[PDB]
Amino acid sequence: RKNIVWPEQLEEQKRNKQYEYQWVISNGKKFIARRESTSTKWEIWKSIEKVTPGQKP
Amino acid sequence: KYTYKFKQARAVPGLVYWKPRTPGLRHKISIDYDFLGVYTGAPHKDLSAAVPKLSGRNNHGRITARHRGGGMKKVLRQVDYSREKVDGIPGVVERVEKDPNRSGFLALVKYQPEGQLPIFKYHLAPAEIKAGDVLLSGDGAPVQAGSTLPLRSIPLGTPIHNLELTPGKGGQLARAANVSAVIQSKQLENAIVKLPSGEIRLINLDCRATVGRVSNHLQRMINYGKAGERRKLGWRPSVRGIAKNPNDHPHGGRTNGGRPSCTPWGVYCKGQRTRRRNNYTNKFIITRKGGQPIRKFAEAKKLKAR
Amino acid sequence: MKRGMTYQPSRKKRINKHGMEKRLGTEDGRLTILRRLEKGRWRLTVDMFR
Amino acid sequence: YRNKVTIEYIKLKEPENDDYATRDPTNYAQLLGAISISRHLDRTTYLYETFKDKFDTIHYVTALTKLPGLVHYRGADLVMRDGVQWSEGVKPFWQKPNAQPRKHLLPKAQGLLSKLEEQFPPHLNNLFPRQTANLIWAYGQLKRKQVVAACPFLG
RNA sequence: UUACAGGCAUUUAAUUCGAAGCAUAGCGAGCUAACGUUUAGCAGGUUUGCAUAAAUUAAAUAUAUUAAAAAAGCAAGACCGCAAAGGUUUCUGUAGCAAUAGAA
RNA sequence: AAUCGUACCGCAAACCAACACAGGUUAGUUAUUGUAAAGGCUGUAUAAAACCAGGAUAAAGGAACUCGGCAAAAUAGGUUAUGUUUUCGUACAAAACCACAACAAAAGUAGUGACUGUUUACCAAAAACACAAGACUCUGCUAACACUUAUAGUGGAAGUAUAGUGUCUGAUACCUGCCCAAAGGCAAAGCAAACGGCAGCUGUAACUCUAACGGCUCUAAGGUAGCAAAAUUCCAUGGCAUUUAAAUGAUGUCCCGCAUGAAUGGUAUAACAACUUCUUAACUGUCUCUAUUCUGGAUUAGGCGAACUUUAAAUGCUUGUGCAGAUGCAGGCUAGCUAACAAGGGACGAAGAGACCCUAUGCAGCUUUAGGGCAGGUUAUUAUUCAAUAAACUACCUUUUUUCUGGGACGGACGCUCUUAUUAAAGAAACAAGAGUGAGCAAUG
Ligand SMILES: [K+]
Ligand SMILES: [K+]
Ligand SMILES: [K+]
Ligand SMILES: [K+]
Ligand SMILES: [K+]
Ligand SMILES: [K+]
Ligand SMILES: [K+]
Ligand SMILES: [Mg+2]
Ligand SMILES: [Mg+2]
Ligand SMILES: [Mg+2]
Ligand SMILES: [Mg+2]
Ligand SMILES: [Mg+2]
Ligand SMILES: [Mg+2]
Ligand SMILES: [Mg+2]
Ligand SMILES: [Mg+2]
Ligand SMILES: [Mg+2]
Ligand SMILES: [Mg+2]
Ligand SMILES: [Mg+2]
Ligand SMILES: [Mg+2]
Ligand SMILES: [Mg+2]
Ligand SMILES: [Mg+2]
Ligand SMILES: [Mg+2]
Ligand SMILES: [Mg+2]
Ligand SMILES: [Mg+2]
Ligand SMILES: [Mg+2]
């Protein structure tokens, strides 16, 4: 079996994942939306109450 | 060779002799892991992975390895055959575990490098290593079971296992249950090593090996009592050649064995050689299994042609 | 055993095996579409609707 | 060996120079070659649509200079000579007065040229006398044929 | 000799209809065969080999120990059997209810 | 907080089967001690034929039936002192005792496979296959081997000779003898648990018989133990004993056995079997020998409304005749008319351009030491830093495998001369008959 992915490889790929960030407003509340660089789907990640803009969480 | 007197005696420790309550239990002999102290639970989460069964089918989807598939779920363990990462750091054995993918036993070892977090690894268990033992590798280690050293620092008569053909790729030669290899002499840049099959070969002195044997001495005493016991392991039944029809096998016809025994593709299977006569690796093999000199094998059809 | 029941309908199977997206994925499927355009069939695939 | 055998080796001769007819260019030089040796307007239009962004000043000049040769005259306005073959300054036919282009080629040439003229202006300051001369010659040919009425960049 | 009409012959699908088959290219695993991933089901009873607890409950109470279904478990290609999956024997049916069914 | 599903059918007259088709179709829930809450569903008009199907009861006998206890019937269940066999776990016999209403069905002998399993959808479920287990052989890791145009890639295996590939035997117990000559295959000049083989004649012990014991020929070796009228035996229903009133049967036993025999295994074996064989107990409409009866169809009435088939018809018997078995032709007979219910002798009755056999410009699949080829792998030789050639082994491609004939096969025959019968001109056939020949001579011109 020449193709196996071990847990160490899974964690390395997860830590090397890039995202595109976009701020949106919903019902007067601000949310952060992100899209994975290798996909075309956007999703709402978190709100500004739990995230600090300007850092790398 | 299994005999019914062996099961009746019920002598060898470490085996489970199932009482003949049913037809499928009369000849069944297994291994008692609890009596041996071998852990038979789930593997370490950070050193294991769940994978689908292939059932002997390649990327084209066709059967290339016959009589496979239909077993239980498969989980694979990652084993560090080369301990070059942890050369200086000593390791403490936590458990000895059983793996259905191999015939030997694996050992879980924890390392504590200075200034870092603990590290866990799997290693092929030597013959006489139990939980709590200390394993060491690299220069400055004693010549004792479980130690990994280059061939330049191993005595001639000491049995070894998990030997590396290449300097740093990893051990590949001696892995099966209760097997070992010995060193006969050491030359300028090579050592003469006798392999478990009885072959004498040249191996570079910078390769590494582990002192001792493999850690399962009850492999040959097992008897599966049922057909379904090997079905659960992932093996399927096979049909004899003379039982098939002419369009299926060379032995298909009504008569039995009209022609000398051969493979399904017509190759004689009772002594015909399959290794390449001009194989590049002939330069490292001194004597083949059974005592045949390499030159006798390399130059056998050339004399007949002449 | 009684025969004649070789068809077991499944909507997901029908789209995947004979759908337009499948016919357009290979060269031979594209040729099949052209053959049906040349003959002038009103419905090109089982997957088509307005 | 009752039936004697004779063996012959046949070599398949091929043209020395490659005609960029089917393969897609993948380099700066390959794109120039495909444009220069293009045989039909459909080929030139295909190259521009697919590799639009991989164009330079030389590529735009080459496309313009070759467009006049891809516009063919009507077969009814040409008379074939008896046995004459293409040579240096000699053609296998002579043209009737005021020959007209093919009916179905004018819209293609006009459409293709309009796209080229749109993207050219930024490259006007990177031309050499050879490139300027070829552009002037090409437009004059494109005016003799009913493709353009004036040269936007004449000034 | 040339032309025309006719009879016969040669060649080209050549009086008409009809095979089992051979070669090349495409469409099929929603039936069935093997396999992969995910999911679910199998009343009520019987026989047998093992298994003891953050400190099992009582008595002995040291010493020596003893009694108790004191176990919300594992094992069996185990047994009688409702569902279910099969198709052993008989009869009915035979263009039939059914191009393979019904009752026992 | 947007977007899509929400009606109706869903063990069915609405889904899969051409149908309102006795077939097929997944999961989740509900009442009920000997019963059963909710909910759901509903059949042209009659009856005192034969016959057919599915049930019930039956005097006396109880397998006398039949290829065969097929089908039907039957105290069927539980606990036992004692005995037998075991692979020590099991399995079987057993007088007797114990049962509220429901549910109910044997043992022994032999043959073959250890066992649970799997198989020809639609005539074969088995002794066939698989199986745990034994042995042989190949494979040093970029392993052998398989898929592929392979220069890729993938399975083997992320395994490492206590492992993996292929082959034959088939739990277990006791055993497993000799041969590598010739023609092949493979290999390290050797290999049989690789493919295969394993004789004949003749003389001899008190009377007889037999031959313990001799002689000769030949071969690579000459079948050892075991078992044996077999799932193997042509004479054949072999001889003897048991079993019955009666034995081509069953069991045991005698045995160079046309043509038994040791891993294409030999001989036994507890348990197991919708497998084949025989026997015992009990039970019975299987039978002597049938009778009565219930339900449904048939049968009678109204309504609705098919199919096979049809050269034309107003369509008797008998003997004779004839393409050789006559409703239709010749003689001798036959005289109210049309149907209903019932039976099935004939119409060489209907259904499917005979399958058996022979004949083709025949077709296809399979096999091989029938001919030819090299186009994959292996092997050999040579050359450049994944190549070229081939009388070899494996795989693959293509082609050939007469006619005559008292049907075909088997056997025999096919050219050319002389002679016999079909009279005394010539000619004249049969797988009719009786004899020659495919040369010789340098002189035998
Ligand atoms: K097998
Ligand atoms: K055969
Ligand atoms: K079973
Ligand atoms: K064999
Ligand atoms: K059976
Ligand atoms: K009749
Ligand atoms: K005859
Ligand atoms: Mg067969
Ligand atoms: Mg069971
Ligand atoms: Mg079946
Ligand atoms: Mg009676
Ligand atoms: Mg009788
Ligand atoms: Mg069996
Ligand atoms: Mg069974
Ligand atoms: Mg069948
Ligand atoms: Mg069966
Ligand atoms: Mg059957
Ligand atoms: Mg055995
Ligand atoms: Mg035999
Ligand atoms: Mg056998
Ligand atoms: Mg009626
Ligand atoms: Mg007559
Ligand atoms: Mg008459
Ligand atoms: Mg016929
Ligand atoms: Mg003939």
Numbering used by the authors:
A (entry chain Xc): 37 to 93
B (entry chain Aa): 57 to 362
C (entry chain AB): 114 to 163
D (entry chain Xd): 63 to 217
From the paper:
Ribosomes consist of the small subunit (SSU) that selects aminoacyl-tRNAs cognate to mRNA codons, and the large subunit (LSU) that contains the peptidyl transferase centre and polypeptide exit tunnel. Both subunits are composed of a catalytic rRNA core and scaffolding proteins. Mitoribosomes of green algae display a great structural divergence from their tracheophyte relatives, with fragmentation of both rRNA and proteins as a defining feature. Here, we report a 2.9 Å resolution structure of the mitoribosome from the alga Polytomella magna harbouring a reduced rRNA split into 13 fragments.
Further data processing and classification revealed distinct classical and hybrid tRNA binding states, supporting the engagement in active translation. All bacterial protein homologues are conserved with the exception of the universally lost bS20, and the functional sites for mRNA and tRNA binding remain largely unaltered. In addition to fragmentation of the rRNA, we also noted three occurrences of protein fragmentation in the conserved bacterial homologues uS3m, uS4m and uS7m, each one of which is split into two nuclear-encoded fragments. We found that the rRNA contains a non-canonical reduced form of the 5S, as well as a permutation of the LSU domain I. The mt-5S rRNA is stabilised by mL40 that is also found in mitoribosomes lacking the 5S, which suggests an evolutionary pathway. Finally, in the exit tunnel, mL128 constricts the tunnel width of the vestibular area, and mL105, a homolog of a membrane targeting component mediates contacts with an inner membrane bound insertase.
